[PDB]
Homo-oligomer: A and B are copies of this chain.
Amino acid sequence: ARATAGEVEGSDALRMDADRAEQCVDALNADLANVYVLYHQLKKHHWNVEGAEFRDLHLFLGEAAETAEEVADELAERVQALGGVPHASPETLQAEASVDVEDEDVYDIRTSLANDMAIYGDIIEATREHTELAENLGDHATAHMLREGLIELEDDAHHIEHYLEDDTLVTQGAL
């Protein structure tokens, strides 16, 4: 094997010592797992959503899934850049993830959306801390990246929050 899961040789090219590096690699790899299960959950809801606002949510969730995948790729590559070994197998990703994943059953859209909002929140708070950890460790590049992705994650979470709000054009009459 060229590398062993868990090891963090740092990077000479990036002038990042394995000491500072390991701190980020541990933070980043934690997020990679959470974002990737988020990815798979958003896909799930993307595939299953039904109802009156089905097509609108179908496209929204699709985009959200895509954003998650891009964010995940950014993390995984930043880890590998810092000399680490990013989580890879689906099994490892879920194991390492600290958020709540739904059992293989299919729930109504409000429940599902509500569950995703929950995953977003955890990832959003974990990420805010990691950017500080990065700015403090002097790793401005990683900090910058995290913010760039954070901005996207927060917009998707806020959208889910608006979908769940208590308003509508539907009137008891039209029912």
Contact = CB atoms under 8 A, between A and B. Distances in A.
Interface of A: 1-5, 11-15, 36-37, 40-41, 43-44, 47-58, 60, 69, 73, 76-77, 80-81, 85-95, 101-110, 113, 117, 120-121, 124-125, 128, 131-132, 138-141, 143-148, 150-151, 154-155, 157-175
Given A3-B105, A60-B55, A104-B85, A144 B148 contact: yes
A154 B55 contact: no
A174 B43 contact: no
State how many copies of this chain the complex holds: 11
A144 B138 contact: no
B106 A2 contact: yes
A160 to B, nearest CB: 6
Contact of A89 (B11, B77, B94, B155): B94
A147 B146 CA distance: 12
Given A2-B107, A104-B5, A88 B158 contact: no
A118 B117 CA distance: 36
Nearest to A4: B105
What are the 9 closest A-B residue pairs judged by CB atoms, nearest first?
A13-B161, A51-B167, A52-B169, A90-B90, A5-B104, A50-B165, A44-B88, A3-B106, A1-B105
Given A13-B158, A147-B140, A104 B80 contact: no
A138 to B, nearest CB: 6
Contacts of A158: 11, 13-14, 81
Contacts of A11: 158, 161
A153 B92 CA distance: 25
Contacts of A95: 91
